[PDB]
């Protein structure tokens, strides 16, 4: 809190209560900026003071946290909801969101119509999505340099534990194509957990 | 015992009766002001009053001069 | 609840906690030795050549202190010796590395230097075996 | 004394300041509340209407705001948040006039004169749609649905509302049709598609097991009697002190009841509905299972709502004990239906009931407890909008846009009125222009600039146009699908004018001891 | 002129992305429109001087951040 | 990739491209909408810069190399490199590997955009603020 405490439960009215909420929103996000990517960094969350967990996933971090504000509350749930969906986008989604909420209360307030101000944000995402659909320049594995062979090669070089993209590129091509169960969810797809991958020492 | 001395007794007698007085004076005569009685100490409600009976009884008397008058009236 | 403190601020707290443990045990290892005396909360004396013992009986802290207790326990189960050794290595490295390379500004490079020192160390130490 | 001056200034400060906070209405504005209570519970709120009814205050002046919303729902069922915000405008007027040296009794008088003129001008701008004509009713209902949460269940809902109100209706422009006749029941199961309008009376209750009358012919039961059986209300000389002796008393007790329920069925009962409050245990818990067998419906510990509707509409009156036989003062009936629908739900429908030429019931269905809630709010507002036309017809601008419009027409009428009261009303015209302004203000940062601008755009359009408040843009507001009933805005002014006036009237401190 | 300053600035950029014209804000009329066709005509040279002087003035201040003062 | 034919260099890379384009569009529209898109746009640029920091390649280095390849006549989606648009996220500096597994397709990246916007709509969605005793 800051401002008057004439009223309570996250009420202080005027400029102060808005200012309080956006800073808090930003603190969550900052944790997830350092944990962002496949380059993400380990954090230590102390859960009592006789327990610890080590995590580096964006949604997970936020779950253990103690929300105590409405801004806090909506933002963790947004991350967790995304975790339920795919569990990809989870580190990123928070970070973009922190900036957006602050900017927008200003612009929605500076209305000609509030439904129109929100619609501009929509108009930006509608172009974005359209673009995203139009693109086949990068991450095409079906019209790749070597189709699924090239896609796998570059993936194993990015996550290299020795010399990989060699023997290991060929594996990725085999496992998807070894399942002849089509799972029609929009175009034919294969499970990559119907495969048998074995360890041998 | 408590003794409230010669000036002071008369002062309590004047302010106490003046305050209760100003409640029933608005409704009295032709249309002017009314009372809308504000209840919070017994129970939390508002009451729409215009009769002097309601106004005077419902609010206690704890000023000793004030007691006598509300009973006679 | 949530507490937020960012960057190099958090990273000093780690040094502070680790080195204090590491120093006397750095003397206790070898064929010469020292004593880490506990003054107990109930009084009386307990004194060991092993730092984890004394941490366990009192004083646990959030960053390094809990990490030193947990790695050293795995160590006892494994070989059964060198419980003493771990804690010193962990604290001297974090002590000396962090400060000069943070002022310069490069945390993630330092993490990659630890690998290059792991790779070197295995090769050279095995030749002299 | 000094007790009248200071109370009026603070009470007006204290409602008005809360009304400033509260004014964030229409569209997405302000920042959410997660609320740590004064009793230590976590509560989350959204929607202006739902908050105001719920609001728990102890400041006498602020309580007026809570109850203002509730009266509005009962007459209009529209404009529940609206009526509070415009009341806060009238409070804004009251301070500025105290400084000028216009006495408080005078400011009360002026509210009446503000009301009298204002509502007449609302009726002038309004386009008078017919309250018995379906087409215009159908457009109007879309307006209210599309302004609420629904935008795709809206399709189903518009036509059911025009039909429902048609059943209760009375031809006049006088006050008729209520939600004391429109009965609103929830049912788990069905979907928003399957929602059903029964022109008679249907009651919401829970009926034991599934396997009961779903056919025609019924004598509707309104009983106020407990059974006579051994260890109930008839003599037994068998006194228990054993599990075995307990078993005998209960066996002979349940047995006699199996006979009894046949006399209940002889009557024609296929519906029986038990009283709310016992006279010992009422019909016993054993009786209810036996009744189920005869093919006769149950509900013990009946809600209050059912008791009021049955007696009024169907003429159904209490009847004598069964051993003494039923008195036959029961109403007419012809349907006992246990409504099951997608595997769930227990309900009573009464078709072929007698009526006074009123009383419809809509059944509200949804496959999940939240999905019922989504139908329920949306329909409530759609029923109510068509309702408002019968009570008093016509369409004016919606969203609270004619209170902004009314301001221009109304300043003129004050100046030519040339009273004591003129100054109070002129100052209120300028205060009604703040309502889109104040709404936006609180949300963000940079307040001043936008605030002045919205008043220019609405004013300049003249007496027939301004900014819309559901689309923005300066365009004709009187008919364009940004409409609400005449009833909603006249009712809102009326309620406001009374509650506010009361703050001015008091003098000196008052607190019952 | 009496407008919302942030709302206005954005409309002039639109006609500097739809023609590259002369759209700006008038105080010489108190409206928004082309200023060349409104005869709001002043030399190139006032603008030449004002840019170069504003940069020059600027570079000095951001460069100093170590100030040695003597109250002698 | 099999489910949705359409693909992008995912992570923050689609984002880095889109910043410039949604800005060209913001300007064009003008009025209140120019701000709406423009705040939306600058929020896209920041994520690959913050990611860079983590792998210690820094923000300054990242923006500098990347925005050059995008141009006003390289707004094209193509299907081959003539302007870069990807951004390997492990490397933390743009390369020319155009099928890495640090890219993620259209399916995740559309819902990333929608969820970041939603958070602004929702906190706003409230009408009325009260304290309950």
Residue with tokens 């002046």: D61
Contact between D232 and D286 under an 8 Å Cβ cutoff? The reply is no
* Residues β-bridged to residue D348: D203
E56 is in an annotated binding site: no
Q: What is the DSSP string of D290-359?
A: HHHHHT----SS--HHHHHHHHHHH-------STT--------EEEEE---BTTB---EEE-S---SS--
How do beta strands D360-366 and D182-188 pair? Answer: parallel
What is the C-alpha to C-alpha distance for residues D12 and D61, in angstroms, rounded to an integer?
7
Binding-site annotation: residue ranges of D for ADP: 27, 79-82, 146-148, 399, 484
Residue with tokens 């204290």: D14
Contacts of C119 (CB under 8 A, 6+ apart): none
Gap from A144 CA to chain C (nearest CA, Å): 32
Contact between A84 and F107 under an 8 Å Cβ cutoff? The reply is no
* Residues β-bridged to residue D45: D33
Cα distances from D84 to residues D6, D339, D497, in angstroms, run 24, 41, 11
Contact between D220 and D314 under an 8 Å Cβ cutoff? The reply is yes
Contacts of D57 (CB under 8 A, 6+ apart): D63, D65, D66, F133
What is the C-alpha to C-alpha distance for residues D127 and D394, in angstroms, rounded to an integer?
6
Gap from C107 CA to chain F (nearest CA, Å): 7
Contact between F4 and F105 under an 8 Å Cβ cutoff? The reply is yes
**Dihedral Cα D339, D345, D346, D352, nearest 10 deg:** -30
Q: For residue D446, which residues of chain E lie inside 8 Å, CB to CB?
A: 6
Closest CA to D88 of D434, D465, D467, D486: D434
**Dihedral Cα D131, D136, D140, D143, nearest 10 deg:** 180
| Identity of the residue in A120, A121, A139 whose CB atom sits nearest the CB atom of F9 | A139
Question: Is D206 in a helix, a strand, or coil?
Answer: coil
Contact between F50 and A34 under an 8 Å Cβ cutoff? The reply is no
Cα distances from F69 to residues D19, D484, F38, F87, F97, in angstroms, run 54, 55, 21, 12, 15
Gap from F32 CA to chain E (nearest CA, Å): 6
A174: tokens are 């085999």
What is the C-alpha to C-alpha distance for residues D28 and D51, in angstroms, rounded to an integer?
16
Put simply, whether B59 touches D (Cβ < 8 Å) is: yes
What is the C-alpha to C-alpha distance for residues D81 and B48, in angstroms, rounded to an integer?
24
Burial annotation D52-73 (CB, 10 A radius, 16+ → b, else e)? beebebeebbbbbbbebbebbb
Closest CA to F59 of F67, F48, F43: F48
Contact between A65 and F85 under an 8 Å Cβ cutoff? The reply is no
Active-site positions of D read 47, 80-81, 381
Contact between A173 and A190 under an 8 Å Cβ cutoff? The reply is no
Q: For residue F30, which residues of chain E lie inside 8 Å, CB to CB?
A: 10-11, 13-15, 17
What is the C-alpha to C-alpha distance for residues A46 and C63, in angstroms, rounded to an integer?
9
Contacts of C17 (CB under 8 A, 6+ apart): C61, C62, C63, C64, C65
Contacts of A158 (CB under 8 A, 6+ apart): F88, F90, F91, F97, F100, F101, F102
What is the C-alpha to C-alpha distance for residues A177 and A172, in angstroms, rounded to an integer?
9
C124 is in an annotated binding site: no
Burial annotation F9-47 (CB, 10 A radius, 16+ → b, else e)? bbbbbbbbbbbbbbbebbbebbbbbbbbbbbbbebbbbb
Contacts of F11 (CB under 8 A, 6+ apart): A37, A92, F47, F48, F51, F87, F89, F102, F103, F104
Closest CA to C21 of C97, C84, C108, C102: C84
Contact between A25 and A2 under an 8 Å Cβ cutoff? The reply is no
Number of H helices, E strands in chain F: 4, 0
Burial class of residue A17 in the structure, from the number of CB atoms within 10 Å of its CB (0-12 exposed, 13-18 middle, 19+ buried): buried
Q: For residue A107, which residues of chain F lie inside 8 Å, CB to CB?
A: 32, 35-36, 39
Contact between A56 and A34 under an 8 Å Cβ cutoff? The reply is no
How do beta strands E23-26 and D333-337 pair? Answer: unpaired
Question: Is D259 in a helix, a strand, or coil?
Answer: helix
Cα distances from A173 to residues A24, A190, F10, in angstroms, run 46, 12, 21
Closest CA to A135 of F77, F80, F18, F76: F77
Q: Of all residues in chain D, what percent are helix, strand and coil, respectively (each to 5)? A: 50, 10, 40
Put simply, whether A107 touches D (Cβ < 8 Å) is: yes
Gap from F49 CA to chain C (nearest CA, Å): 15
What is the C-alpha to C-alpha distance for residues A131 and F8, in angstroms, rounded to an integer?
9
Residue D490 backbone dihedrals phi, psi, to 5 degrees: -75, -35
Contact between D157 and D385 under an 8 Å Cβ cutoff? The reply is no
Closest CA to D361 of D228, D210, D164, D493: D164
Contact between D221 and D205 under an 8 Å Cβ cutoff? The reply is no
Contacts of F44 (CB under 8 A, 6+ apart): A96, F12, F15, F16, F18, F19, F22
Contacts of D273 (CB under 8 A, 6+ apart): D203, D205, D220, D221, D222, D223, D297, D298, D299, D302, D306, D310, D348
Contacts of F13 (CB under 8 A, 6+ apart): A138, F48, F85, F86, F87, F89, F103
User: How wide is the angle at C-alpha D460 spanned by C-alphas D454 and D461, nearest 5°?
Assistant: 100
Contacts of F2 (CB under 8 A, 6+ apart): A142, A176, A187, A188, A189, A190
Burial class of residue D186 in the structure, from the number of CB atoms within 10 Å of its CB (0-12 exposed, 13-18 middle, 19+ buried): middle
Other CB atoms within a 10 A radius of the CB of residue E2 amount to 9
Under an 8 A CB cutoff, do E6 and D453 touch?
no
Under an 8 A CB cutoff, do A159 and F90 touch?
yes
Q: What is the DSSP string of chain A?
A: --S--SS-SS---HHHHHHHHHHHHHHHHHHHHHT-STT---EEEESSSS-EEEE--HHHHHHHS---SHHHHHHHHHHHHHHHHTS-SHHHHHHHHHHHHHHHHHHHHT-S-HHHHHHHHHHHHHHHHHHHHH--SSS-SSSSSSTHHHHHHHHHHTT-SSS-SSHHHHHHHHHHHT----EESSSEE--SSSS------
Contact between D453 and E4 under an 8 Å Cβ cutoff? The reply is yes
CB < 8 Å & 24+ apart, contacts of D287-291? D287/D227, D287/D257, D287/D260, D287/D261, D288/D208, D289/D208, D290/D254, D290/D257, D290/D258, D290/D260, D290/D261, D291/D261, D291/D264
F88: tokens are 């390997």
Under an 8 A CB cutoff, do C2 and A39 touch?
no
E near F: at least 3 beta-carbon pairs less than 8 Å apart: yes
Residue with tokens 């009814």: D53
Number of H helices, E strands in chain B: 3, 2
What is the C-alpha to C-alpha distance for residues F63 and D416, in angstroms, rounded to an integer?
67
What is the C-alpha to C-alpha distance for residues F76 and F91, in angstroms, rounded to an integer?
25
How do beta strands D214-218 and D333-337 pair? Answer: antiparallel
Under an 8 A CB cutoff, do D506 and B42 touch?
no
Can you list the positions of beta strands (E) in B16-73? 35-39, 45-49
Cα distances from A150 to residues A137, A171, D476, F98, in angstroms, run 14, 12, 62, 9
Put simply, whether C66 touches A (Cβ < 8 Å) is: yes
Cα distances from D246 to residues D231, D250, D260, in angstroms, run 10, 6, 22
What is the C-alpha to C-alpha distance for residues D280 and D366, in angstroms, rounded to an integer?
38
Q: CA torsion sign, D342 to D344 to D345 to D351? A: positive
Put simply, whether D3 touches B (Cβ < 8 Å) is: yes
Residue among E4, E7, E10, E30 with most chain D CBs within 10 A, to mutate:
E4
Q: CA torsion sign, D5 to D6 to D10 to D13? A: positive
Burial class of residue E44 in the structure, from the number of CB atoms within 10 Å of its CB (0-12 exposed, 13-18 middle, 19+ buried): exposed
Q: For residue E6, which residues of chain A lie inside 8 Å, CB to CB?
A: 110
């Amino acid at each position: 809190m800051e401002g008057p405490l004439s009223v309570f439960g996250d009420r202080s009215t005027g400029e102060t209560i808005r200012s309080q909420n956006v800073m808090a929103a930003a603190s969550i996000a900052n944790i997830v900026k350092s944990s962002l990517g496949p380059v993400g960094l380990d954090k230590m969350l102390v859960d009592d003071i006789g327990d610890v967990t080590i995590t580096n996933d964006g949604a997970t971090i936020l779950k253990l946290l103690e929300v105590e504000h409405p801004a806090a509350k909506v933002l963790c749930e947004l991350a967790d909801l995304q975790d339920k969906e795919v569990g990809d986008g989870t580190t990123s989604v928070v970070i973009i969101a922190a900036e957006l909420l602050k900017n927008a209360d200003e612009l929605v307030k500076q209305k000609i119509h509030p439904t129109s101000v929100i619609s501009g944000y929509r108009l930006a995402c509608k172009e974005a999505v359209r673009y995203i659909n139009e693109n086949l320049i990068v991450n095409t594995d079906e019209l790749g340099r070597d189709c699924l062979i090239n896609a796998a090669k570059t993936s194993m070089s990015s996550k290299i534990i020795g010399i990989n993209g060699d023997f290991f590129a060929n594996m990725v091509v085999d496992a998807v194509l070894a399942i002849k169960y089509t799972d029609i969810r929009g175009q034919p797809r294969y499970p990559v957990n119907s495969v048998n991958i074995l360890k041998a020492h | 015992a408590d003794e409230e001395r010669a000036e002071t007794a008369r002062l309590t007698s004047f302010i106490g009766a003046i305050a209760i007085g100003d409640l029933v004076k608005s409704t009295l005569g032709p249309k002017g002001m009314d009372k809308i009685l504000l209840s919070s100490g017994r129970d939390a409600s508002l009451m729409v009053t215009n009769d002097g009976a309601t106004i005077l009884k419902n609010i206690g008397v704890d000023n000793p001069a004030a007691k006598v008058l509300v009973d006679m009236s | 609840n949530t507490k937020r403190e960012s960057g190099r601020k958090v990273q000093s707290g780690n040094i502070n906690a680790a080195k204090t443990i590491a120093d006397i045990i750095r003397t206790c290892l070898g064929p010469k030795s020292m004593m880490k005396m506990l003054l107990d909360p109930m009084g009386g004396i307990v004194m060991t050549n092993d730092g984890n013992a004394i941490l366990r009986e009192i004083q646990v802290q959030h960053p390094a202190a809990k990490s030193m207790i947990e790695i050293s326990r795995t160590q006892d189960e494994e070989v059964g010796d060198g419980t003493t050794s771990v804690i010193i290595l962990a604290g001297e490295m974090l002590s000396v590395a962090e400060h000069f390379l943070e002022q310069q500004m490069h945390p993630t490079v330092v993490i990659s230097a630890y690998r290059k020192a792991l790779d070197d160390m295995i090769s050279t130490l095995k030749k002299i075996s | 004394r000094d007790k009248p001056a200071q109370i009026r200034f603070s009470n007006i400060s204290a409602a008005k300041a809360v009304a400033d906070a509260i004014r964030t209405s229409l569209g997405p504005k302000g920042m959410d509340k997660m609320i740590q209570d004064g009793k230590g519970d976590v509560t989350i709120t959204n929607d202006g209407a739902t908050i105001l009814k719920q609001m728990q205050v102890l400041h006498p002046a602020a309580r007026m705001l809570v109850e203002l919303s509730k009266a509005q729902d009962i007459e209009a069922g529209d404009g529940t948040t609206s009526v509070v915000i415009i009341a806060g405008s009238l409070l804004d007027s009251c301070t500025k006039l105290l400084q000028k040296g216009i006495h408080p009794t005078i400011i009360s008088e002026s509210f009446q004169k503000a009301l009298e003129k204002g509502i007449e001008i609302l009726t002038d701008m309004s386009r008078p749609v017919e309250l018995s004509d379906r087409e215009t009713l159908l457009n109007s209902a879309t307006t209210s649905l599309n302004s609420k949460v629904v935008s795709q269940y809206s399709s189903l809902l518009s036509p059911m509302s025009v039909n429902a109100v048609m059943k209760v209706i009375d031809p006049a422009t006088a006050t008729s049709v209520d939600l004391r006749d429109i009965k609103i029941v929830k049912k788990l199961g069905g979907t928003i598609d399957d929602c059903e309008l029964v022109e008679g009376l249907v009651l919401t209750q829970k009926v034991s097991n599934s396997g009961i009358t779903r056919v025609e012919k019924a004598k509707i039961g309104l009983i106020q009697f407990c059974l006579s059986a051994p260890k109930t209300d008839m003599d037994n000389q068998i006194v228990v002190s054993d599990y075995a002796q307990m078993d005998r008393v209960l066996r002979e007790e349940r047995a006699y009841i199996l006979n009894l329920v046949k006399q209940i069925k002889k009557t024609g009962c296929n519906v029986l509905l038990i009283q709310k409050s016992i006279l010992r245990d009422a019909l016993s818990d054993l009786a209810l299972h036996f009744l189920n067998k005869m093919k006769i419906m149950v509900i013990k510990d009946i809600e209050r709502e059912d008791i009021e509707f049955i007696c009024k509409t169907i003429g159904t009156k209490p009847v004598a004990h069964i051993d003494q036989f039923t008195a036959d003062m029961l109403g007419s009936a012809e349907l006992a239906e246990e409504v099951n629908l997608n595997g769930s739900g227990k309900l009573l429908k009464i078709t072929g009931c007698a009526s006074p030429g009123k009383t419809v019931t809509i059944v509200v269905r949804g496959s999940n407890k939240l999905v019922i809630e989504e139908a329920e709010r949306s329909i409530h507002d759609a029923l109510c909008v068509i309702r408002c036309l019968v009570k008093k017809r016509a369409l004016i601008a919606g969203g609270g846009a004619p209170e902004i419009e009314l301001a221009l027409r109304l300043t003129e009428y004050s100046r030519t009125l040339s009273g004591m009261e003129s100054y109070c009303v002129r100052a209120f015209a300028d205060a009604m222009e703040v309502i889109p302004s104040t709404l936006a203000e609180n949300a963000g940062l940079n307040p001043i600039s936008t605030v002045t601008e919205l008043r220019n755009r609405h004013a300049q359009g003249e007496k027939t146009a301004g900014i819309n408040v559901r689309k923005g843009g300066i365009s004709n507001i009187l008919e364009e699908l940004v409409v609400q009933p005449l009833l909603v805005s006249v009712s809102a002014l009326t309620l406001a004018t009374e509650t506010v006036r009361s703050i001015l009237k008091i003098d000196d401190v008052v607190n019952t001891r | 002129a009496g407008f919302d300053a942030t709302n206005i600035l954005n409309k002039l950029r639109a006609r500097h992305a739809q023609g590259g014209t002369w759209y700006g804000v008038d105080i010489n009329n108190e409206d928004i429109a082309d200023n060349f066709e409104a005869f709001v005509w002043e030399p190139a040279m006032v603008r030449i001087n004002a840019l170069t002087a504003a940069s020059e003035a600027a570079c000095l201040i951001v460069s100093v951040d170590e100030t040695i003062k003597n109250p002698r | 990739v099999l489910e949705s034919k359409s693909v992008v260099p995912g992570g923050g890379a689609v984002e880095a491209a889109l910043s410039i384009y949604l800005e060209n569009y913001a300007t064009s529209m003008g009025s209140r909408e120019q701000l709406a898109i423009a705040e939306f746009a600058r929020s896209l640029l920041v994520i690959p810069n913050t990611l860079a920091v983590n792998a210690a390649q820094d923000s300054t280095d990242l923006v500098a190399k990347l925005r050059a390849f995008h141009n006003e006549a390289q707004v094209n989606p193509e299907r081959k490199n003539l302007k870069w648009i990807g951004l390997d996220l492990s490397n933390g500096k743009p390369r020319d590997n155009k099928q890495a597994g640090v890219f993620e397709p259209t399916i995740v990246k559309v819902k990333s955009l929608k969820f970041a916007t939603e958070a602004a709509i929702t906190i706003l969605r409230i009408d009325d603020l009260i304290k309950l005793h």
